[PDB]
C-alpha cells in the first residue's frame, strides 16, 4: 500500500497570502477530517502551511490530488512532512536537540528528505 515517506502531516508551499481559515479547510478538508492546520505568518514563512490529517490514508490521497493543483493563480506545492526539512532554518547545532528530542520522545523519524 504506502511508501516510507508518507505521513499524516503535509507541507504546503506557494499558498496565496490572503487565504482564510475557511478556504484552507475547504480545500484540504475535502480529503478527510483535519487534525489541524498551521499557517505561516512571519516574513520568512508567509505562503507556507502545515495541514495535519486525522488519518494517514486521507493524507496520502490529498497529497496525490493536491500537489501541483491550481488554486487562485498559483500551483500549490504539497509535500509530505519531514522533521529534518521542517527544521532547516535552525542553526546547524540547535537543530540536533529538537531532531533528537523528537526521535526520542515521540519516535517520529529524523532522517533528511532523501
Amino acid at each position: 500500500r504506502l511508501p516510507p515517506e508518507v505521513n499524516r502531516i503535509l507541507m504546503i508551499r506557494n499558498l496565496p497570502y490572503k487565504i482564510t481559515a475557511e478556504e484552507m479547510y475547504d480545500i484540504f478538508g475535502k480529503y478527510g477530517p483535519i487534525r489541524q492546520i498551521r499557517v505561516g505568518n512571519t516574513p520568512e514563512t508567509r505562503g507556507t502551511a502545515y495541514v495535519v490529517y486525522e488519518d494517514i490514508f486521507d493524507a496520502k490521497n490529498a497529497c496525490d490530488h493536491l500537489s501541483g493543483f491550481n488554486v487562485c493563480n498559483r500551483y500549490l506545492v504539497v509535500l509530505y512532512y519531514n522533521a529534518n526539512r521542517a527544521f532547516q532554518k535552525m542553526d546547524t547545532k540547535k537543530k540536533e536537540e529538537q531532531l533528537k528530542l523528537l526521535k526520542e520522545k515521540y519516535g517520529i523519524n529524523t532522517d533528511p528528505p532523501k
Partner: protein, 35 residues
C-alpha cells in the same frame, strides 16, 4: 513475506496513532499560527 506484510501493516499503524497537541507542537518550527 508473511513477515513483510505484517511489519508493513505494523508500520502503517504506528504512523496512524492519535496525536496530542503537545506532540504536535514539538513537530513544527517557529513562525506558524494555528488556524
Amino acid at each position: 513475506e508473511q513477515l513483510q506484510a505484517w511489519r508493513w501493516e505494523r508500520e502503517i499503524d504506528e504512523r496512524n496513532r492519535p496525536l496530542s497537541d503537545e506532540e504536535l507542537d514539538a513537530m513544527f518550527p517557529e513562525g506558524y499560527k494555528v488556524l
